Each structure stands twice: as structure tokens, then as C-alpha cells.
Enzyme design. Sequence first.
Site, PDB file in Angstrom:
ATOM      1  N   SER A  50     -38.785   8.478  27.399  1.00 14.14           N
ATOM      2  CA  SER A  50     -39.667   9.689  27.174  1.00 14.14           C
ATOM      3  C   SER A  50     -40.315   9.463  28.578  1.00 14.14           C
ATOM      4  O   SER A  50     -41.246  10.416  29.270  1.00 14.14           O
ATOM      5  CB  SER A  50     -41.114   9.739  26.197  1.00 14.14           C
ATOM      6  OG  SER A  50     -40.578  10.135  24.763  1.00 14.14           O
ATOM      7  N   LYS A  53     -40.333  12.972  31.027  1.00  8.61           N
ATOM      8  CA  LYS A  53     -40.516  14.082  30.194  1.00  8.61           C
ATOM      9  C   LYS A  53     -41.412  14.525  31.425  1.00  8.61           C
ATOM     10  O   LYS A  53     -41.458  15.903  31.908  1.00  8.61           O
ATOM     11  CB  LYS A  53     -41.341  14.311  28.981  1.00  8.61           C
ATOM     12  CG  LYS A  53     -40.256  14.289  28.246  1.00  8.61           C
ATOM     13  CD  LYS A  53     -41.072  13.879  27.103  1.00  8.61           C
ATOM     14  CE  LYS A  53     -40.194  13.978  26.386  1.00  8.61           C
ATOM     15  NZ  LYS A  53     -40.352  12.677  24.267  1.00  8.61           N
ATOM     16  N   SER A 110     -45.725  14.021  24.210  1.00  7.12           N
ATOM     17  CA  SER A 110     -44.729  12.931  23.856  1.00  7.12           C
ATOM     18  C   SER A 110     -43.783  14.226  22.735  1.00  7.12           C
ATOM     19  O   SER A 110     -42.235  14.085  22.466  1.00  7.12           O
ATOM     20  CB  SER A 110     -43.916  11.526  23.460  1.00  7.12           C
ATOM     21  OG  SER A 110     -43.211  11.384  24.735  1.00  7.12           O
ATOM     22  N   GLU A 146     -32.683  14.455  23.617  1.00  9.90           N
ATOM     23  CA  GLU A 146     -33.610  14.547  22.416  1.00  9.90           C
ATOM     24  C   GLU A 146     -33.376  14.628  20.761  1.00  9.90           C
ATOM     25  O   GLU A 146     -32.828  15.882  21.351  1.00  9.90           O
ATOM     26  CB  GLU A 146     -35.037  14.992  22.794  1.00  9.90           C
ATOM     27  CG  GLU A 146     -36.214  14.378  23.762  1.00  9.90           C
ATOM     28  CD  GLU A 146     -36.276  12.481  23.669  1.00  9.90           C
ATOM     29  OE1 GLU A 146     -35.973  11.856  22.688  1.00  9.90           O
ATOM     30  OE2 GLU A 146     -37.073  12.962  24.514  1.00  9.90           O
ATOM     31  N   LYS A 214     -47.046   8.315  31.727  1.00 10.84           N
ATOM     32  CA  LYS A 214     -46.400   8.723  30.029  1.00 10.84           C
ATOM     33  C   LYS A 214     -45.487   7.282  30.155  1.00 10.84           C
ATOM     34  O   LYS A 214     -45.076   6.926  30.888  1.00 10.84           O
ATOM     35  CB  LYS A 214     -45.526   9.570  30.847  1.00 10.84           C
ATOM     36  CG  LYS A 214     -43.922  10.378  30.328  1.00 10.84           C
ATOM     37  CD  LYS A 214     -45.072  12.022  28.643  1.00 10.84           C
ATOM     38  CE  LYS A 214     -44.554  11.545  28.087  1.00 10.84           C
ATOM     39  NZ  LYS A 214     -44.713  10.103  26.654  1.00 10.84           N
ATOM     40  N   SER A 215     -45.339   7.731  28.804  1.00 10.65           N
ATOM     41  CA  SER A 215     -45.060   5.866  28.422  1.00 10.65           C
ATOM     42  C   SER A 215     -44.039   6.652  28.074  1.00 10.65           C
ATOM     43  O   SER A 215     -43.175   7.621  27.227  1.00 10.65           O
ATOM     44  CB  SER A 215     -46.000   5.208  26.833  1.00 10.65           C
ATOM     45  OG  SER A 215     -46.317   6.322  25.958  1.00 10.65           O
ATOM     46  N   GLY A 216     -42.716   5.489  27.177  1.00 10.86           N
ATOM     47  CA  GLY A 216     -41.547   6.047  26.485  1.00 10.86           C
ATOM     48  C   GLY A 216     -40.801   4.924  25.618  1.00 10.86           C
ATOM     49  O   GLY A 216     -41.589   3.861  25.946  1.00 10.86           O
ATOM     50  N   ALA A 217     -40.889   5.029  24.073  1.00  5.56           N
ATOM     51  CA  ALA A 217     -39.864   4.783  23.445  1.00  5.56           C
ATOM     52  C   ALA A 217     -38.997   4.429  22.480  1.00  5.56           C
ATOM     53  O   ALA A 217     -38.127   5.826  22.896  1.00  5.56           O
ATOM     54  CB  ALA A 217     -40.416   4.019  22.482  1.00  5.56           C
TER      55      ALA A 217
END
Length: 269
Positions: A50, A53, A110, A146, A214-217
Amino acid sequence: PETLVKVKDAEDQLCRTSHRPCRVGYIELDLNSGKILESFRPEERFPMMSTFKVLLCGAVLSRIDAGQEQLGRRIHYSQNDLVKYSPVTEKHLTDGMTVRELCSAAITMSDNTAANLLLTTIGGPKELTAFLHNMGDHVTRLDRWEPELNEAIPNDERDTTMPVAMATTLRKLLTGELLTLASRQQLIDWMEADKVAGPLLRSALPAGWFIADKSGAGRRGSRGIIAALGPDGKPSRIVVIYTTGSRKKTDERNRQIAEIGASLIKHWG
Ligand SMILES: [Zn+2]
């Protein structure tokens, strides 16, 4: 070295039990100059998850600057569009959502459907990639939508970036003249309003500091974060951390990133 010693320990800890390709990537840049302060595996590839984004909303804002799009333009979308993890979009089927609201949802929450709808506005993942190339990032690529872009197939280059490419691209988006100031201000504000990255860098951040992130997994242990941060309520450095391949649980992966954060704060200088 101390933060780099910590990044390597993190990698050793997350990857010892992996029995598949596994790594951590890190870079810290000076926001004003673009100078690389420190790095670990700067040109290796990691799934974006993510964190893409922010780049997407960059492309969208570029179109707004060019008068090809409007922040207020409303998109009514179908239930058929909704994908996993759509906390905002699934609440606005009736009333729809503006471009501005979709970026807010994609960045701060997210929201996956928000991201897919924004991708559609620019012509899809290949067009995001064409945007990136056009602004001097010849590394980062989005290929899927996504949620498939989070597959994190070991050493697959689809939907990846490199720490240094992401860090530089983020810097150009937040501080360049690539975007108008109005657009840069909005992008960073959406990042600052991030609601879903609490257990990462924000958990190590002293009060009073600024952070826009901004994080992501994703699958196969993939986790990461991109951030502009600094003391005394304004940003002064860009930090990018990615990891993929670990078999350790979410909370341990989060803790390791938070600890990298605690180290780079401690040794900020
Ligand atoms: Zn290129």
C-alpha cells in the site's frame, strides 16, 4: 553505523527462520538536499504494497495540476468494484466519493477499492508506471491491482520498488516542482493524517515531531513504510523501510520496524 547495525539485526532476526529469500531495505535521505544519509540494500527490490498509494495520488494530483482532473470530481462506483479492506469506500456506495475523498481513503486508511478507483482514473497500473518513468523513477513499477499486487512472490519484480528509488520519488513528490505547491501540500497532508501506521515509526516518534507516512503489508512477510519526518513539527528527512520473505508474525515484524525507528530517532543528530 548504529542504525545500520540495528537494520542488520532486524534482518537477521526476521529472516533466520525464513528458508526463502528474505531481506530488509532501508534508506534515510535529507529532505532539503536529497543527500543519502544512510542506507541498507538501497537498490534491491521490495514489494511496495500500500505504499504505492502515495505515488498513485501523486499521479492523480499531476493530472489535477494539468487540468485533466478535479479534486471535487465525483465517482459513483459499483458494489462489483469493492475488494478486501475497503473501510471507507464500502460506506459510500450511495453518495459516491470525490477524487479528494478517494485519495484520503487510499492514503489515510489504506482503502483498497479507493486505490483501484484512482487507478482507473489514470488508466491503470501501467499508466502509474509511465508516470513514474516520466518523472525520473525508472525503477518503480506497478503491474497489478488491489489485492493481487501484494502476492510478494519471492524475487518477482512486479509491483516493486527499491528503497533509494522510493525515497527519491517521495522527495520529488513532496518537495519538487513536479507538482504544484497546492498539490504537494495536499499529498503530504494525506500522509500526515495516516490512521493505520500506528505500530511502526509512529510508535517510536517523540511528541512534537512531524510525521507524514504510508505503511504497507502484503503476503510472505512483506511489510514497509515510507515517511517524511522531523523534530519540532516539520519534516526534514525521508525514511524508507521495507522487508519481505520473513515467516515471523505481524507483531514481531512491526516491532522490528518500530525499533529501526527508535534507533534512527535516537541517532538523528
Ligand atoms: Zn524509464
